[PDB]
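Q: What does the assembly look like in three dimensions?
Context provided by user:
Components: two
Sequences:
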Amino acid sequence: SMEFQAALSRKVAELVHFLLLKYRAREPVTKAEMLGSVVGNWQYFFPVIFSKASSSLQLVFGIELMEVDPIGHLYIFATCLGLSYDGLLGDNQIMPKAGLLIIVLAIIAREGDCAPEEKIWEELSVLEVFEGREDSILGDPKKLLTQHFVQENYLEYRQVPGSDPACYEFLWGPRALVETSYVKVLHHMVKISGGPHISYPPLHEWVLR
Amino acid sequence: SMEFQAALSRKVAELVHFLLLKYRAREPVTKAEMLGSVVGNWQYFFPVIFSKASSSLQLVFGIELMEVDPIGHLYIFATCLGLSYDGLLGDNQIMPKAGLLIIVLAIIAREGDCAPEEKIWEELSVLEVFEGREDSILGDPKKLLTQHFVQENYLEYRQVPGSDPACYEFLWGPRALVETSYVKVLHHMVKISGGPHISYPPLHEWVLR
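A: Here is the predicted structure of the complete assembly.
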């Protein structure tokens, strides 16, 4: 079962990267093509493989998979929230970055008008994408990543006013305010997490014996 | 530990009902009064007892606990979303109903303009508040409860147009549309669930070996 779940997980990863190649090539893709990429008895599990792969694209890569033909089941791709950026570079196999960008925007959005950089590092250091390589000579990968977002004008970075010694904070840049909004981003994070997950308290926490 | 968690849970229930009595009496309450109601070594755990009790009031009872004096730590109460209804009856010790009302409104809101009654029963039958007494002679308690919400004009109940044999659906009534909105309700459910809970997929689900 644990061995089965892992094997199932592997089939998800394969569909994700099948779809990523289509995304890069800007090729529309049918459900029949996706099902065709899944081999053998695993086709029986295509519904969960598809929905898991589809969720991965949104959450991890910031990529939306949209059906434009409900009869022939033809899908196209779009960047989440309609952003004009995915952080790619030619055909180099580097990771699409819009999902990570949206996560940073969201962290800031929950904190108000701006967030101390320490909160950003704290929240980002949890993501397994950085695979514990913060001791890189070139510099902490997660910090160099946020520099992309600043230089693309999705983020601004400044000294906290009146701070001594200097502290620094992130805020939304002009490009983020144009292409989306606070509400849209926080709504998006809810949507792609599978709605709100309400842990209802047990009876003995609100009923007296 | 399991025995400790349960004992801790019991202290939460006691604070909840301490606060409920204040709520019924429309008495403001200080943090010092709350801490005073907690006995002995359990005072060391007041922060988690408070936050758990505070969340219970919102989620279960539809009651907001609001600090109006940040210096003396004086709190008052309000109905969640500002609704003019809590479903109480004099000093009879029956459960405040606004939390259950908001949950029903939310179920409908997620489904669009209306929801089949079967979806309502399905979602409601999960709540432990009904303690498996759906076989009551008087009628299924959860169904009789929604009748309160209809008669108070928070909900409307009608036959699904063109259904044969007749099927039925719930929708927001005039009173719900006046006092709140779809957006506000779904936002509220997120807020009181402790933000969106994002289960990020494991590396082997989106990285190839």
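Follow-up: Helices of chain A lie at 2-25, 31-37, 46-59, 98-111, 117-124, 141-151, 174-179, 182-191.
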